[PDB]
A paper describes a structure:
Prohibitin complexes are dome-like structures consisting of prohibitin -1 and -2 heterodimers that assemble in the IMS via their N-terminal transmembrane helix. Prohibitin-1 and -2 (PHB1 and PHB2) are members of the Stomatin/prohibitin/flotillin/HflKC (SPFH) protein family. Among other proposed functions, the prohibitin complex supports cristae architecture and negatively regulates the activity of the matrix-resident AAA protease (m-AAA), which cleaves numerous matrix and IM proteins. Three-dimensional (3D) subclassification of the subtomogram averages revealed two distinct conformational states of the prohibitin complex present in untreated and OA-treated cells, both of which resolved to approximately 20 Å.
A second conformational state became evident from 3D classification of the subtomogram averages. We refer to this state as the open conformation, because density is absent for approximately 25% of the side of the wall of the dome. In the open conformation, [name] to 2 heterodimers are arranged in an asymmetric spiral that are flexed outward by 2° relative to the closed conformation. The open complex is also roughly 20 nm in diameter and protrudes 8 nm from the IMM. In the open state, density is missing for the SPFH domains from 3 heterodimer pairs. The density quality and resolution are lower for the open state, and it seems likely that the open state density reflects an ensemble of related open states rather than a single unique conformation, as highlighted in Movie S5. The closed conformation manifests additional density extending 3 nm on the matrix side of the IMM, while the open complex is associated with minimal matrix density. Quantification of the two populations of complexes revealed a statistically significant shift from 75 open to 56% open after depolarization, indicating that the prohibitin complex is basally in a dynamic assembly of states and that depolarization drives the complex toward closure. On the basis of its two distinct conformational states, we propose that in untreated cells where prohibitin complexes are more open in confirmation, the open state is “active” and allows access of the m-AAA to its import substrates for processing. Here, we found that like HFLC/K, prohibitin adopts both a closed nearly symmetric structure as well as an open asymmetric conformation.
Author numbering:
A (entry chain B), B (entry chain X), C (entry chain D), D (entry chain F): 177 to 272
E (entry chain A), F (entry chain C), G (entry chain E): 191 to 299
Write the structure that this text describes.
Amino acid sequence: KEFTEAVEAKQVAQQEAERARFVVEKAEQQKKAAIISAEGDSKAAELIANSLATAGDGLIELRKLEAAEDIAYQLSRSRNITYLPAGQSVLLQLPQ
Amino acid sequence: KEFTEAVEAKQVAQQEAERARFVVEKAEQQKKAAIISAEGDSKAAELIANSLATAGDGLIELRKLEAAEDIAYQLSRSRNITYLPAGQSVLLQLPQ
Amino acid sequence: KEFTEAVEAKQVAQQEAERARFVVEKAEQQKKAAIISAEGDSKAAELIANSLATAGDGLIELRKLEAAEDIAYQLSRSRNITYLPAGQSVLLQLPQ
Amino acid sequence: KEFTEAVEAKQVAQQEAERARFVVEKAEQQKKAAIISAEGDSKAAELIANSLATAGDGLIELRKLEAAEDIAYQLSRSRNITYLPAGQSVLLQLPQ
Amino acid sequence: REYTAAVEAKQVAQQEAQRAQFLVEKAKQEQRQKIVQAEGEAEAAKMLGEALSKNPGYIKLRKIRAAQNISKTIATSQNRIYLTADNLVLNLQDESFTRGSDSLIKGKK
Amino acid sequence: REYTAAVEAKQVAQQEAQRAQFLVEKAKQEQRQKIVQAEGEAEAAKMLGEALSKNPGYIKLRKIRAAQNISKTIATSQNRIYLTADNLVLNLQDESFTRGSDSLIKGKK
Amino acid sequence: REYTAAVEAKQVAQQEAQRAQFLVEKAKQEQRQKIVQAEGEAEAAKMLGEALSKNPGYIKLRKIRAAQNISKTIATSQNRIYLTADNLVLNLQDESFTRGSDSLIKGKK
């Protein structure tokens, strides 16, 4: 069963090797696309970085406060979310 | 049969491409109008920020009170309420 | 019964020995090929290591933040997973 | 019952003495065979140590990590696994 | 199956590399769309820094209001988050009462 | 069973050593493809490193927005958890209330 | 039982000890086979050691990205785990927040 399968694998692998030279080309193009989309996200991010670096940590904390509303909004669609103060000696003991 | 379905999926991708053209335009528009809708809510923020950088937290003292009445009615629904320490070496066991 | 079994094992051992000498040669080719799939991965890794060594820890932490979203995405397709502070005297418990 | 059994054990134990002579002739050979399969494993290993010494902890780490995909593929057939931070006063508990 | 698939995929790959440059354009557009989502976020950012890096006043007050809003939606939150003893000081009689309420003192804040 | 199997394995292993150098080539092409996948991951890596390793401005705000994308994903998260209390600084009436986020004065952060 | 068993064992063992030096040979070929499977692994290892031993750039980012891969797998995971919550550092109002990802400044990571 491995003889015909090996021959077809060699043929399909030559087809896929040429198709995959062109798929490495496609991958350069698709990476232009994915880079630029993940960088939709992340260039929004870098302009946020510039805003917070020039202006200071204003919305560093205030999306750490506005989006901190997300904590109370969204923590316990489950049932066991919580926290524990620091600068201290907490006896952490997760719930059951 | 599956060939028609694959062609249909390809056409769906092309229609997403058209929708993304009109998302290009929508993106121009919310460039302008999301920058400046920010500007609005955010300048409520500008002046509260300056007012408080000068003096300190004025409005959620009075609105610990007012928003206590209202949205801490929306917290008198909050079943489990306790009230944190800090400035010491606080150490904790908590609800299961 | 061990007589015929062991004689058959002797003949099988001859064929498997010569077979496996050439399986080791074919495995020189296949070790190159498996180094090559692991190269897909690991050479993405070479370029990532170069990228991060040259450009600091941006996505060291931002796959620890962006793809740390994966942590919430996945940790809980079972119901007993968690993430919990330290820098304290944390005296960890884990649940039933 | 132990008279006939004792005589049989007597004769069979002398026979097993001679059978021992040649069972560990066979087991000179079988020590070699098991040695050598475990040596396939362990010389993959000799040259793995060679590769990761001439190169370093790259995949000493990443067949922890790429193979930690396997950690998670294999652990979860069970339902009580854990991994819990150090640098604490962990009194680690266990589930039920 | 993979042979015809591979050849058709190579031809479709030429036409789809053309359409992949088209995708680069479309994804620069999505670039702008998410640029702008988080750049409304970033307008908030630039101004909140300019108004708070001076001294975090709305950030003091918005730790307070985000603690209040975090409480406020902790209401609907089943979360077994808590607080603990002695800051909102409801040791209503205490020095800590004048170290949580007089903690409002600047320098202590 | 294993005798003819091993002989045919030797012959097909000649064929498959040829096809295994051919696998070197084909899996090299899939290697470049997978390189390129995890290297779009890596271009995220580069981009973010150059952008935010000099000073994590948006990596600060992404600690933030990705702790909140994590906790926009904590819905799936049955996960019992623990943040820290002086993180949400629900220490409203406290000395360390705005030790947490008068760290907006850079240097504490 | 053990008498004829032992006699046949000794004869079958003469020819099986011939067969078992022959097993030294056979298992040696299997030895090299397993060697070369885990050598695909091993030279991936050499290459990754040149990739990473120089600097844990992708060792850092892969602590983290394997964290995320292991995690995409921890879907199936029941494993009851921990963090140190200052690892994602979700410290959403805190000084230790920008100690977690001011580790972006290489040296603390």
